[PDB]
Swiss-Prot record:
Its EC number is 3.4.21.62. The lineage of its organism: Bacteria, Bacillati, Bacillota, Bacilli, Bacillales. Subtilisin is an extracellular alkaline serine protease, it catalyzes the hydrolysis of proteins and peptide amides. Subtilisin NAT also has fibrinolytic activity. The keyword Protease applies. It is found in: Secreted. The gene is aprN. The chain holds residues 107 to 381 of 381 of the full protein. Monomer. Ca(2+) 2 binds at A169, Y171, T174, D197. It catalyses: Hydrolysis of proteins with broad specificity for peptide bonds, and a preference for a large uncharged residue in P1. Hydrolyzes peptide amides. Inhibited by PMSF (phenylmethylsulfonyl fluoride). This is Subtilisin NAT. Residues 5-274 form the Peptidase S8 domain. Optimum temperature is 37-40 degrees Celsius, loses activity at 50 degrees Celsius.
């Protein structure tokens, strides 16, 4: 049978599913380590690899990109798990290799592909303590071109009063996403700062793994796809909403959880964002 991971219900996605909104015709680029396109519980519509050593985007040697994609869009059916937007159009934009690392050049090429191929949403479950001028340029370009960009806040935890948000989540134009558990407690490794925007489930997140299996991971990498999917659910109900509009909904209708330095606006609530 199919299971619904707790995170999916936590952000209220099933309420949208009941209403008939499952992310149909919304194009979501998973900018990551590839996606195992052969996974029975995933439907990958296209893609591109910008990893010179890994020409095939439809395979995932890491598992990270695959697990992220299943949080966004694992298919609604009789097996496995269920995505936030199970009818979303999933694109494999390989910019990380099988070790789960990549170069800013490769990342930028992926985002450039996303723009040229008219994606509605970009998931970047990645980041680092410094950015590059070229990365900010292309991330801002994607935003100004109409794309919702969800980026992982990072897993650097707290450090007194200092921001530990990584790039590209640190940039104003991106949605910076932190991790909570099933009780809405911030996860201890979740990066903090004024640049942190919202929270999503990021602890013990069951999702798809390459080879057609399922497993749980922790991180802001797992939180982030809940927000990417949520953006797809919203757009599938509100096809004329702008990326600015979707962001401001996801943010303003979030469930306040505490001090914004630690929680931003709180836990996303897609039912309330989509109203």
């Amino acid at each position: 049978a199919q299971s619904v991971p707790y995170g999916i219900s936590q952000i209220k996605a099933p309420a949208l599913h009941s209403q008939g909104y499952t992310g149909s015709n919304v194009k979501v680029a998973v900018i990551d380590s590839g996606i195992d396109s052969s996974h029975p519980d995933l439907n990958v519509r296209g893609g591109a690899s910008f990893v010179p050593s890994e020409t095939n985007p439809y395979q995932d040697g890491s598992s990270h990109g695959t697990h992220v994609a299943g949080t966004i869009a694992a298919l609604n059916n009789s097996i496995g798990v269920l995505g936030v937007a199970p009818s979303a159009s999933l694109y494999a934009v390989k910019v990380l290799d099988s070790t789960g690392s990549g170069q800013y050049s490769w990342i930028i090429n992926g985002i450039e592909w996303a723009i040229s191929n008219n994606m509605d949403v970009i998931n970047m479950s990645l980041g680092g303590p410094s950015g590059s001028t070229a990365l900010k340029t292309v991330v801002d370009k994607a935003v100004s071109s109409g794309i919702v960009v969800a980026a992982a806040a990072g897993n650097e935890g707290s450090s007194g009063s200092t921001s530990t948000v990584g790039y590209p989540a640190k940039y104003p134009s991106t949605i910076a996403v932190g991790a909570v558990n099933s009780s809405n407690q911030r996860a201890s490794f979740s990066s903090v700062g004024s640049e942190l925007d919202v929270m999503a489930p990021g602890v013990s997140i069951q999702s798809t793994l390459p080879g057609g299996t399922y497993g749980a991971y922790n991180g802001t990498s797992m939180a982030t796809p809940h927000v990417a999917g949520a953006a797809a659910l919203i757009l599938s109900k509100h096809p004329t909403w702008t990326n600015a509009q979707v962001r401001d909904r996801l943010e303003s209708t979030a469930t306040y959880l505490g001090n914004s330095f630690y929680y931003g606006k709180g836990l996303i609530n897609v039912q309330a964002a989509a109203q």
